[PDB]
Amino acid sequence: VLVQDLLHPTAASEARKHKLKTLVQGPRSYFLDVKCPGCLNITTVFSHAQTAVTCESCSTILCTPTGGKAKLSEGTSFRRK
Amino acid sequence: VVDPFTRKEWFDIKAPSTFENRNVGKTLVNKSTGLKSASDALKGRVVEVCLADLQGSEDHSFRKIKLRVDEVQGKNLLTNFHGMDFTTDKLRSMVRKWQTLIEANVTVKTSDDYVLRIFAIAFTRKQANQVKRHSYAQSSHIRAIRKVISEILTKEVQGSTLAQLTSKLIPEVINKEIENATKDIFPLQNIHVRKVKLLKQPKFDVGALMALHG
Amino acid sequence: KFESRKIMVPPHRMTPLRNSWTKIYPPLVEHLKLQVRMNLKTKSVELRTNPKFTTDPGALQKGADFIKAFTLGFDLDDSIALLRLDDLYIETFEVKDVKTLTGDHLSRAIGRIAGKDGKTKFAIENATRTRIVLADSKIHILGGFTHIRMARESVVSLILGSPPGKVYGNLRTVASRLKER
Amino acid sequence: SQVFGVARIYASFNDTFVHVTDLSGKETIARVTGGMKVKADRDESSPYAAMLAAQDVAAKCKEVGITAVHVKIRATGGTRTKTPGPGGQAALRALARSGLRIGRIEDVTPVPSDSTRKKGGRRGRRL
Amino acid sequence: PLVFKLINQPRPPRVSILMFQREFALRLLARPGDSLYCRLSANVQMWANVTHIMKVESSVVRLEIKNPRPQVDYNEWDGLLRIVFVRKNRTISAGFKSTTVMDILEKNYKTFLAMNNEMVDDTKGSMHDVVKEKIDTVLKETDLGDKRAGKCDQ
RNA sequence: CCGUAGGUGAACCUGCGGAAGGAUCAUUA
RNA sequence: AUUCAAUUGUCAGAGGUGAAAUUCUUGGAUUUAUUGAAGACUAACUACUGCGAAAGCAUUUGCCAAGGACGUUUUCAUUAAUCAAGAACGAAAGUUAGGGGAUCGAAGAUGAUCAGAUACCGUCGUAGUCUUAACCAUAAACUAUGCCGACUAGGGAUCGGGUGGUGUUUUUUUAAUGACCCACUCGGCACCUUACGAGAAAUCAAAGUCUUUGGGUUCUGGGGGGAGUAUGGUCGCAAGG
Numbered sequence A: 001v002l003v004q005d006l007l008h009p010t011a012a013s014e015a016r017k018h019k020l021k022t023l024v025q026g027p028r029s030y031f032l033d034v035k036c037p038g039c040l041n042i043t044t045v046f047s048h049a050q051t052a053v054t055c056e057s058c059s060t061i062l063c064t065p066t067g068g069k070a071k072l073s074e075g076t077s078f079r080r081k
Numbered sequence B: 001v002v003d004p005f006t007r008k009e010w011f012d013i014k015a016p017s018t019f020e021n022r023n024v025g026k027t028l029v030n031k032s033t034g035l036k037s038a039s040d041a042l043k044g045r046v047v048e049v050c051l052a053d054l055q056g057s058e059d060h061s062f063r064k065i066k067l068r069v070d071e072v073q074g075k076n077l078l079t080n081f082h083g084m085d086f087t088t089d090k091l092r093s094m095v096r097k098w099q100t101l102i103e104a105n106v107t108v109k110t111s112d113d114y115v116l117r118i119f120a121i122a123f124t125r126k127q128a129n130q131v132k133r134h135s136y137a138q139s140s141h142i143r144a145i146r147k148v149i150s151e152i153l154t155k156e157v158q159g160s161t162l163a164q165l166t167s168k169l170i171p172e173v174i175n176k177e178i179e180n181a182t183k184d185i186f187p188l189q190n191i192h193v194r195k196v197k198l199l200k201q202p203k204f205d206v207g208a209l210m211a212l213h214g
Numbered sequence C: 001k002f003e004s005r006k007i008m009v010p011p012h013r014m015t016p017l018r019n020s021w022t023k024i025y026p027p028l029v030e031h032l033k034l035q036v037r038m039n040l041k042t043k044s045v046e047l048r049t050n051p052k053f054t055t056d057p058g059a060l061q062k063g064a065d066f067i068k069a070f071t072l073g074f075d076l077d078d079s080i081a082l083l084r085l086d087d088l089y090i091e092t093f094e095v096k097d098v099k100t101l102t103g104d105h106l107s108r109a110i111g112r113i114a115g116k117d118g119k120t121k122f123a124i125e126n127a128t129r130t131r132i133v134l135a136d137s138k139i140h141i142l143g144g145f146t147h148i149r150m151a152r153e154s155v156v157s158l159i160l161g162s163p164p165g166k167v168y169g170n171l172r173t174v175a176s177r178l179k180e181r
Numbered sequence D: 001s002q003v004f005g006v007a008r009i010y011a012s013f014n015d016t017f018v019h020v021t022d023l024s025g026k027e028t029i030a031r032v033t034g035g036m037k038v039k040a041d042r043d044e045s046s047p048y049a050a051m052l053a054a055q056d057v058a059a060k061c062k063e064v065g066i067t068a069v070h071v072k073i074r075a076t077g078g079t080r081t082k083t084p085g086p087g088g089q090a091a092l093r094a095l096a097r098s099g100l101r102i103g104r105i106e107d108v109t110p111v112p113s114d115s116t117r118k119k120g121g122r123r124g125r126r127l
Numbered sequence E: 001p002l003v004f005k006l007i008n009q010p011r012p013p014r015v016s017i018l019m020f021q022r023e024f025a026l027r028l029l030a031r032p033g034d035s036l037y038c039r040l041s042a043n044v045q046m047w048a049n050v051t052h053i054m055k056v057e058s059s060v061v062r063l064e065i066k067n068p069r070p071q072v073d074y075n076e077w078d079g080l081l082r083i084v085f086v087r088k089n090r091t092i093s094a095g096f097k098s099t100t101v102m103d104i105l106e107k108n109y110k111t112f113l114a115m116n117n118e119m120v121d122d123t124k125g126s127m128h129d130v131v132k133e134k135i136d137t138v139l140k141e142t143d144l145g146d147k148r149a150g151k152c153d154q
Numbered sequence F: 001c002c003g004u005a006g007g008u009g010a011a012c013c014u015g016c017g018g019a020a021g022g023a024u025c026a027u028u029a
Numbered sequence G: 001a002u003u004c005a006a007u008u009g010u011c012a013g014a015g016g017u018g019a020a021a022u023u024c025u026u027g028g029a030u031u032u033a034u035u036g037a038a039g040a041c042u043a044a045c046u047a048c049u050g051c052g053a054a055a056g057c058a059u060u061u062g063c064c065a066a067g068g069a070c071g072u073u074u075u076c077a078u079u080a081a082u083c084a085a086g087a088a089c090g091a092a093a094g095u096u097a098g099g100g101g102a103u104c105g106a107a108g109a110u111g112a113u114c115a116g117a118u119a120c121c122g123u124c125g126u127a128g129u130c131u132u133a134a135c136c137a138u139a140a141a142c143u144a145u146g147c148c149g150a151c152u153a154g155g156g157a158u159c160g161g162g163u164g165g166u167g168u169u170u171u172u173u174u175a176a177u178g179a180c181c182c183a184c185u186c187g188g189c190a191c192c193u194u195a196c197g198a199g200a201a202a203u204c205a206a207a208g209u210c211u212u213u214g215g216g217u218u219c220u221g222g223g224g225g226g227a228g229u230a231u232g233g234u235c236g237c238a239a240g241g
């Protein structure tokens, strides 16, 4: 371990470490585009959404705050970004 | 000078009709001169026997059962339920140095107007896949299991009377209800109610006790 | 005219039970003429007798005493001494019963009864005709009353925190008028 | 078949009690101390006194006719020790040796949940 | 009790020459503001005139019983100085209501009122009366109570 | 030994709470 | 559990002991059994550990506010780090005035004994131990190691949180979780090997990055006694700091 690249690490081992200990600090979060089937509309929800986000028309709790990640509703589709 | 063995009179006790082997125990009274004094002498007598010897099973299944005498039938004695316990060496072997012990207690009034106290003990298992040399539980887990044991014990003793309590003590139905009702919370092992106290005795009946004998 | 006793198997000693059980049972079955049945599931050993055995009622108590001895850490040569003699009995005692100790005080008391390479333990088995097994909080000494009584005086010297040199001096004093008589 | 007795062995450091009655503690049948069987004060709790005392208890139980017996053994309990002394063990050896039938052997020692202060103080009590 | 044997005998002698231990000789010659002060200091200092000669460790001390003996009863004075000298560092009010001191003192008081025939009330001391509070009233009535045992004189 | 309190003492003992600046053998997972 | 009270049975002891001895037992002692009352205490589960600034903290349940850690494609933008003065807490024992006072128990009352292996032993036992209101401010208050910040080794673990698994188990019919396993990840309690380096050495992931001597800051020591003494000041009812 006398010599190794601190400029170009291998990307398998690079996102393997902590959120704040990378070479440039990046989040490990994402955004979820959720479709409840009852009203059929796009709602962009944070992956660690820490509040009870309802839908704007139906009173369906899309996600509940459970610690790290917000668990999505059952029978409900999602997409990245 | 005078020998009490010349004076004393050999008596006999019998179980109620809940249990199988009725023919257990042979008691003794110093004097048969005062029959009221003999009756009050046998009223406070509490006979502790093993449950397995009371049930005739050859394996001594570590449960002592202690029984109170009430009524006289011609040198034969009616005996009533008073309480249950284990042997102390069972508790000495039974406590493990690498698991979490749960004690649950509930204050009980029964359907037949008894006042009772039930102490149940639960534990933490190893699963079949463990690597950990110790299996402790968090305090909210322990509070949840103690809530569940209090609810199961409370509804179980409220839905039944003394004969059904004795009839559910012997085949371990209560801890089976614990095992499948707490399997959603934590894996639990070696569950038994340890010890049974009577606290209040009601107004004294006659026909219910011979119905328990019948 | 059968008789069976029930006894408990510790978890810490069931692996030397299955290691040296082949040396455990045939001396008592041959010389002492008993019957043994296991229950490996329920940690129980069935010591039973039969009218087809010899009439000896006290050796059933002796056999329960051998398995009570083996319950508490004891090897097989002390079982041979318990076979041959009758004055030899068993004892437990607690560290907290002499002095209220906690944690590292308990550890230093266990170190004082143990010693460097078990040498004060060696000095207390050889000079007193006693045999020493240390538990976590239990002390165990076999033997007769004149032997175990001076073992009591030594161990309540030592667990009180007296230095082991005074233990050695008092030990050879009581051993000196032990073998003198 | 037979009649079982309810036996008590109380094992202090300085005597032994072999004390038996029938069921539920009705009226005491045999009653010995360590002091009555050997008049030497150094030998109150000797196993010789224990076996001779339990032999006399066994003779009392034989003349009243009780053959089976159930025994529990104990120490003082409480702030003092938990398991019985060897005088109780020699008493067990004597009652098994006597030819009397034995029913059950357990350890009803009165065990505290949480004790009070013992009679030694901070430093210690034994020598 | 070494000086008690020569403090109350009939026909008291002329002088008293004797050797004792030196620290008791400090107790017979102790000032009232000392930690060496005791009950026996008061006992000699108004029943037996005493001074130190011939230091020997041991000490010689010389005693003389006052032939005009002052009319003080030894039993009550000895008992009160005992129950305020055992609690030397404590005060005097709460020290009397102890556990069994607060039985024997009103036993002494009931024998003290046996020839007085004072009516013992149902008020009797747990709130404001003779087992609890009139003791505090009569120690307020004298030079004691708040001034400790290492400050009160004869 | 330390802290506190007390009887004292030619030294010193005792009550309560701490520390090792004091020596882990054997056994098992 | 202990102590005491009531009821119960029975007969020469119980108690304590290097040893004996005192104590109380025909009004039946110790002990056995049925109850009751009191106050402390929270064993075994208990470590391969947890929390709190420290002292300290182990029954269950409810309420009251607080705290660490983690998650955060939230919010403020230097608001920070260390600390004379000053302030809060501070084990045990002690002090005032109350309640309680079961056990233990410095004082005291009592017995002893018999030898220079030797008084540790016993029995009553007051204070106290427990709590409330207010003081007191000391300990071997110890990791005998100031606090913040960066770097210089890994790995077996574990506690709290999080991420992922066509991983396991729990079935009801597949899930969901709960528990378990694996690969991590922060943040704690600890372990084992080294030596690059330190030290006088024992030993040390800090006691290293210090003669190649400077990241910021607070306190203390200058041979051993005299002596935490004299004296002055200061707080405290005092003991005392």
Ligand SMILES: [Mg+2]
Pocket: none
């Ligand atoms: Mg030093």
Ligand SMILES: [Mg+2]
Pocket: G084
């Ligand atoms: Mg300052």
Ligand SMILES: [Mg+2]
Pocket: none
């Ligand atoms: Mg200091």
Ligand SMILES: [Mg+2]
Pocket: none
């Ligand atoms: Mg100097």
Ligand SMILES: [Zn+2]
Pocket: A036, A038, A039, A040, A041, A055, A056, A057, A058, A060
């Ligand atoms: Zn919707």
